[PDB]
Design a protein around this ligand. Structure first.
Ligand code: X0D
Ligand code: X0D
Lengths: 145, 145
């Protein structure tokens, strides 16, 4: 298969394609596939609607090469200052996405895999308990799918 | 079975992959191939929708089908040679048969098809790809940067 970050399997490519085509017909490869698709669409809608807020995010959010997770965390804490909800979680993904895009634009491709790791960290440590306690991603799909 | 910390990471990588792809950027070669193939599949199905009527009764592939029979059926699609167009067709036909299998409440057939396709890709099509420009050539031909 094509070279991926963690393997190069042909199954992974097949499963990706089949997941896509099932979702187009209102079906799902799996619950994870359904969550992924729901979040993509949630992200798309949020970005179009709140497009004015997506300008020079690397500056406003202070994300540069050499940023450390602790700095990333203080920044993202501000988004959730008044509590966690699904809308803010969507925003978290969307802002993170826009930052990876901005990074590549600026020939700072090196930030992409670091932003991914920081997001994962923050999810695990700050958001997972709220998510679990509020129905899991199953509830997200019921609300945003 | 699963694990949620991995789940969260998977969600992150998926979303970022998607958002990068929209700007013509890519997470990895694997991600670039996934985008390109989804797109190629959409275009194939838009052009050849006529061929997707009652595939189940025509392709003679059921849950009890052996891989060798699956192989003989797919071989027929490539009877006159392998080309990029036909490799796209292979995915789209697999996709459509999966959707029908869901329509007919034979969901069990979906994972079987996935496994058969991964094997056929591994054994038949990927070797041809490697003689014809590699996955990088597929991305140049069907991808968005
Ligand atoms: C520069 C962005 C400022 N900002 C913002 O424009 N928000 C927008 C949309 S959020 C409103 C509700 C309905 C979801 C607004 O105020 O209209 C924020 O909400 C905000 C405030 C504080 C921190 C952050 C952040 C972040 C962040 C950084 C890295 C990362 F990977 C993910 C992130 F969310 C975002
Ligand atoms: C029921 C006939 C389906 N079929 C078809 O209608 N073709 C159309 C032309 S489609 C456009 C060209 C460029 C591919 C036709 O015959 O007019 C085929 O060409 C065909 C013939 C023989 C086998 C297959 C297949 C398959 C297949 C099954 C499972 C799977 F996972 C993947 C597959 F490709 C597809």
């Amino acid at each position: 298969g094509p070279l991926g970050s963690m393997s190069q399997s042909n199954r992974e490519l097949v499963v990706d394609f089949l997941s896509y085509k099932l979702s187009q017909k209102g079906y799902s490869w799996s619950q994870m596939a359904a969550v992924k698709q729901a979040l993509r669409e949630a992200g798309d809608e949020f970005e179009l609607r709140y497009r004015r807020a997506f300008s020079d995010l690397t500056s406003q959010l202070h994300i540069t090469p050499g940023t450390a997770y602790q700095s990333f965390e203080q920044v993202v804490n501000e988004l959730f200052r008044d509590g966690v909800n699904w809308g803010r979680i969507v925003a978290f993904f969307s802002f993170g996405g826009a930052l990876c895009v901005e990074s590549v634009d600026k020939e700072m491709q090196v930030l992409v895999s670091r932003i991914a790791a920081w997001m994962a960290t923050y999810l695990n440590d700050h958001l997972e308990p709220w998510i679990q306690e509020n129905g899991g991603w199953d509830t997200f799909v019921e609300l945003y799918g």
